[PDB]
Scaffold this motif. Structure first.
Motif, PDB file in Angstrom:
ATOM      1  N   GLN A 132      30.145  48.597  43.163  1.00  0.00           N
ATOM      2  CA  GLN A 132      30.254  50.027  43.172  1.00  0.00           C
ATOM      3  C   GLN A 132      29.280  50.803  42.420  1.00  0.00           C
ATOM      4  O   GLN A 132      29.552  51.226  41.313  1.00  0.00           O
ATOM      5  N   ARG A 133      28.112  50.991  43.046  1.00  0.00           N
ATOM      6  CA  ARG A 133      26.993  51.719  42.556  1.00  0.00           C
ATOM      7  C   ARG A 133      25.982  52.049  43.631  1.00  0.00           C
ATOM      8  O   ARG A 133      25.898  51.553  44.736  1.00  0.00           O
ATOM      9  N   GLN A 174      29.659  31.493  29.729  1.00  0.00           N
ATOM     10  CA  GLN A 174      30.401  32.192  30.749  1.00  0.00           C
ATOM     11  C   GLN A 174      29.732  32.103  32.055  1.00  0.00           C
ATOM     12  O   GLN A 174      30.351  32.022  33.105  1.00  0.00           O
ATOM     13  N   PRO A 232      31.947  38.215  42.824  1.00  0.00           N
ATOM     14  CA  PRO A 232      32.056  39.477  43.501  1.00  0.00           C
ATOM     15  C   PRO A 232      31.511  40.524  42.528  1.00  0.00           C
ATOM     16  O   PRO A 232      31.256  40.224  41.363  1.00  0.00           O
ATOM     17  N   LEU A 233      31.143  41.700  43.048  1.00  0.00           N
ATOM     18  CA  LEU A 233      30.607  42.795  42.283  1.00  0.00           C
ATOM     19  C   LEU A 233      30.601  44.048  43.101  1.00  0.00           C
ATOM     20  O   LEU A 233      29.942  44.053  44.129  1.00  0.00           O
ATOM     21  N   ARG A 248      20.001  50.258   4.573  1.00  0.00           N
ATOM     22  CA  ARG A 248      19.547  50.550   3.262  1.00  0.00           C
ATOM     23  C   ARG A 248      20.015  49.420   2.425  1.00  0.00           C
ATOM     24  O   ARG A 248      20.364  49.646   1.283  1.00  0.00           O
ATOM     25  N   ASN A 289      29.209  34.461  26.329  1.00  0.00           N
ATOM     26  CA  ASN A 289      28.597  34.968  27.516  1.00  0.00           C
ATOM     27  C   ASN A 289      27.592  34.122  28.191  1.00  0.00           C
ATOM     28  O   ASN A 289      27.257  34.392  29.324  1.00  0.00           O
ATOM     29  N   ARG A 307      22.954  48.098  19.705  1.00  0.00           N
ATOM     30  CA  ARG A 307      24.104  47.274  19.420  1.00  0.00           C
ATOM     31  C   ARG A 307      24.401  47.076  17.972  1.00  0.00           C
ATOM     32  O   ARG A 307      25.557  46.997  17.563  1.00  0.00           O
TER      33      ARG A 307
END
Lengths: 179, 212, 189, 138, 52
Positions: A155-156, A143, A152-153, A86, A140, A115
RNA sequence: CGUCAAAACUUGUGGGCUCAUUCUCGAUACGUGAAAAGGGUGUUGGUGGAUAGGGACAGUUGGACGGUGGCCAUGGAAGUCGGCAUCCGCUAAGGAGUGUGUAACAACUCACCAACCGAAUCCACCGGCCCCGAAAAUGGAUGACGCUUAAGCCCCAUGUG
């Protein structure tokens, strides 16, 4: 990315048919709009404001879809104006590297939505550009800029029940997480 | 409690100012709209800050006075008398109506019916609109933080939404401060009282200059 | 979701560590000391088999990044106990009223407070060991030591909390049995 | 700068000033006599009164008692006789035919040989100290 | 006086905190924003009142 | 279109934010306690300044001395209850002195910098989501369950590649 959500059209338009404008002077954007119906609305709209001109008086020559370079990532810079809270127009500068500017616009919009909470009308996305230096600003993007960036990654997922085999009846065998 | 200002958040009715029609006029406190130096040539305060309202609001006098005095207080107390000229840039005047029922002509309950209930003078307020610089304060750059702090009492002497903006404008006066100085330098700027005057490109009959 | 990842451990030298599971099993001079960590698993990668271990992360969230340190340090301290142990010194401190503490060994007995009221007793948990020492001008002094600071400390902090007082002003209150040096058993290798 | 102990007060206008500072006949070093004894009685014929909190200086080899550059004090130290001070309560003072020693005397006199520049330090420095004893005397 | 050192130690105990107003909280020296949730870590912190 | 309850427990093909000892995170439009002010180094993303590798930022380390009260009130403050004060030197730097207070000196401290230091960091703004703020009478109701790599909130998509 490329879930190619949003479309990109270039609109090219002209002022008055009237010889009161003998010789109108012509407008361009390449604009991300999800269809041309909008696109032309938008096009017109700054024309109705920024340029004060009613669409119903004047004439768009063309609205034509506009294609990205090629197959690979280029570093995009994004510049934003959002009007909400507003409390009107406010600016932001954000950074995405991908292969598509479209995906960037797209991604912004959710990003804002999630966001900064925002909603789409209320944004006018100013600009997206491939960034040439080794910068490329944002942490990022920087990055994950690294030569030899790697990872590495874990758990899903994968859908546990399903029609592509197979709901409740599972497991035939034994468990851990799996990888 | 008091027929409280909170409660008068709406407007409903017309504008209600003083009017001939008004004869019930009460009178608030709130008096001295200009504080600091009132013969501060514009040069005196180069600097300009506005204490703006955010919108659309209505405001009591009580609050208004309270900030005023507060404003002066901290300010002067910290910073000196003139080091700004704190100016209430808002005059407000809109007149309030009271019930304040039950004027004692009968027993009790259903005392009135409504019976031309119709509002008595209650107070002044502005039912405000359009992000009005409320008080504007013009300073000298140095005295800026002092300027700000008072505003911290000052905001508090309202309720509602008021915002604090510094302008490129010189102290209640005009243009980006650098261009203003420059404006004097380029001569395009001319002094009146504390208040000041600016030159036209339409150009009239005739200030003339040298020489005899 | 934004990648922190999870994993394991940093290292120094002369002391063995688990390197596996949620559990670090640290072994050195003073024995072996081991802890099992919960969600505390985090970007490991062994740098030497015997000689270099780190865990200093790639990406993730804000909150994550803190932990990494907190984790090393504590296990480092697992090493510390295992190497140089912990030695806490406490002294009873009192002025108006004399105060006495002995050590049963298995337990610590505290007398006198304010003329004494209750007797404060703390059972000596494992490896916090307790000495009332007094010669060498060792003085109203308890010494808690063993190879787990956290325990030696916990028991210790507990003690400071065992010497609490209420009612009728800290501006006249002081006396109690306070921590006087939290250290290692020594310098050691 | 170069600081040293509290000597406190003058306590007597004759020989042996201070409450008990100069009462010992010989100190722990066997330091010899010359500037400590009747010389500080002799001193009193040139100055009296006010805060004489003093300082003691062991720099050479004879006992030495000398007054601080104390304020109010080092000013009234210019006088030649006693009009009778009447006790210091709220920084007392009195006339004694000596003033105007700042801007035309010490400021000019010490202009070529002082801490800092000719007219920024020294001249400016001295002034305030007896600014209201001004009277344009010849 | 249990011993000067002890007093010093003690003082640390006896005096040395600042306090969250709202929740009265016994707070550090270096405290900014209190530890009680329901106080929202509020920032009027007051010094412990010196003893007399 | 989680289950109660028809429909992706949405995956191939998809995005964030958000974690909530609350009587308890939250969650259907209308809807209606939308708690208010007013806050919170919760998180989350700006903007303005920066300082910043000729070194910044933290953390350290050494020094914070000298020409010299430069000073005045002043019972008593030489820098230091109080008040007008203030330049040189040495330098990397060090205040005619940041505090602490022997009535005052002292001493105690660091502001001031080098040395270390080695990379971001530093300030202000910003506004976002998120929390405190947040008390009455029968057991209690985001419908119920519960859900949180959601079944929340928000986002898009049902899509190649």
């Amino acid at each position: 990315m490329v879930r190619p959500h949003l479309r990109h059209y270039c609109v090219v338009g002209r002022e008055t048919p009237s010889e009161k404008n003998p010789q109108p002077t012509v407008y361009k954007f390449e604009v991300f709009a999800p269809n041309f119906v909008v696109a032309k609305s938008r096009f017109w709209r700054m024309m109705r404001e920024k340029n004060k001109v009613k669409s119903t008086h004047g004439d768009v020559l063309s609205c034509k879809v506009v294609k990205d370079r090629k197959l690979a990532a280029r570093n995009y810079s994004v510049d934003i104006a959002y009007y909400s809270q507003r409390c009107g127009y406010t600016h932001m500068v954000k950074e995405f590297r991908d292969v598509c500017k479209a995906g960037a616009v797209s991604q912004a919009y959710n990003d804002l939505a999630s966001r900064h909470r925002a909603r789409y009308h209320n944004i006018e996305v100013l600009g997206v550009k491939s960034i040439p230096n080794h910068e490329v600003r944002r942490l990022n993007v920087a990055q994950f800029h690294p030569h030899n960036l790697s990872f590495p990654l874990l758990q899903r997922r994968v859908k546990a029940p399903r029609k592509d085999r197979v709901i409740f009846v599972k497991k035939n065998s034994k468990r851990a997480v799996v990888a | 409690a008091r027929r409280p200002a909170r409660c008068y958040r709406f407007c409903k009715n017309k504008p209600y100012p003083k009017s001939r029609f008004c004869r019930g006029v009460p009178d608030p406190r709130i008096r001295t709209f200009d504080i600091g130096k009132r013969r501060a040539p514009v040069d005196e305060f180069p600097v300009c800050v506005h204490v703006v309202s955010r919108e659309l609001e209505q405001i009591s006098s009580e609050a208004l006075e309270a900030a005023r005095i507060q404003a002066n207080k901290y300010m002067v107390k910290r910073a000196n008398k003139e080091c700004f000229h704190m100016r209430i840039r808002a005059h407000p005047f809109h007149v309030l109506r009271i019930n304040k029922m039950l004027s004692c002509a009968g027993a009790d309950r259903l005392q009135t019916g409504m019976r031309q209930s119709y509002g008595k003078p209650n107070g002044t307020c502005a039912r405000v609109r359009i992000g009005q610089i409320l008080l504007s304060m013009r300073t000298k750059d140095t005295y800026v933080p002092q300027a700000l702090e008072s505003l911290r009492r000052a905001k508090m002497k309202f309720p509602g939404r008021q915002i604090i903006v510094i302008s490129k404008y010189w102290g209640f006066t005009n243009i980006l401060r650098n261009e203003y100085e420059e404006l004097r330098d380029a001569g395009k700027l001319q002094q009146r009282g504390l208040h000041v005057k600016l030159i036209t490109p339409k150009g009239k009959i005739t200030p003339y200059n040298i020489m005899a | 979701m934004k990648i922190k990842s999870h994993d394991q451990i940093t290292f120094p030298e002369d002391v063995t560590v688990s390197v596996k599971d949620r559990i670090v099993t640290v072994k050195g001079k003073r024995g072996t000391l081991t802890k099992d960590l919960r969600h505390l698993q985090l970007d490991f990668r062994v740098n030497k088999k015997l000689r270099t271990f780190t865990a200093v992360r790639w990406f993730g969230n804000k909150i994550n990044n803190s932990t990494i340190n907190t984790a090393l340090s504590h296990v480092r301290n697992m090493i510390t106990g295992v190497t140089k142990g912990f030695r806490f010194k406490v002294r009873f401190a009192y002025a108006h009223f004399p105060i006495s503490v002995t050590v049963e060994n298995q337990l610590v007995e505290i007398r006198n407070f304010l003329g004494e009221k209750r007797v404060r007793r703390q059972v000596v948990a494992d490896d916090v060991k307790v000495y009332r020492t007094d010669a060498a001008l060792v003085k109203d002094e308890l010494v808690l030591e063993g190879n787990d600071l956290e325990q030696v400390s916990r028991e210790a902090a507990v003690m400071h909390q065992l010497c609490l007082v209420k009612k009728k002003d800290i501006r006249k209150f002081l006396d109690g049995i306070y921590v006087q040096t939290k250290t290692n058993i020594e310098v050691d290798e | 700068p170069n600081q040293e102990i509290t000597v406190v007060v003058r306590a007597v206008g004759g020989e042996v000033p201070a409450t008990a500072s100069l009462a010992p006949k010989v100190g722990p070093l066997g330091l010899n006599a010359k500037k400590i004894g009747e010389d500080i009685a002799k001193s009193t014929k040139d100055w009296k009164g006010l805060k004489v909190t003093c300082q003691l200086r062991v720099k050479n080899r004879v006992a030495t008692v000398v007054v601080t550059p104390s304020v109010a004090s080092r000013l009234i130290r210019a006088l030649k006789e006693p009009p009778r001070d009447r006790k210091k309560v709220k920084n007392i003072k009195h006339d004694g035919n000596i003033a105007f020693s700042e801007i035309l005397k010490i400021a000019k006199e010490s202009a070529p040989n002082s801490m800092g520049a000719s007219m920024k330090s020294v001249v400016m420095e001295v002034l305030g100290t007896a600014v209201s004893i001004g009277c344009t005397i010849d | 006086v249990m011993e000067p050192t002890l007093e010093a130690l003690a003082k640390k105990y006896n005096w040395e905190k600042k306090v969250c107003r709202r929740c009265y909280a016994r707070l550090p020296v270096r405290a900014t924003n209190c530890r009680k949730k329901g106080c929202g870590h509020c920032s009027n912190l007051r010094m412990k009142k010196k003893l007399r």
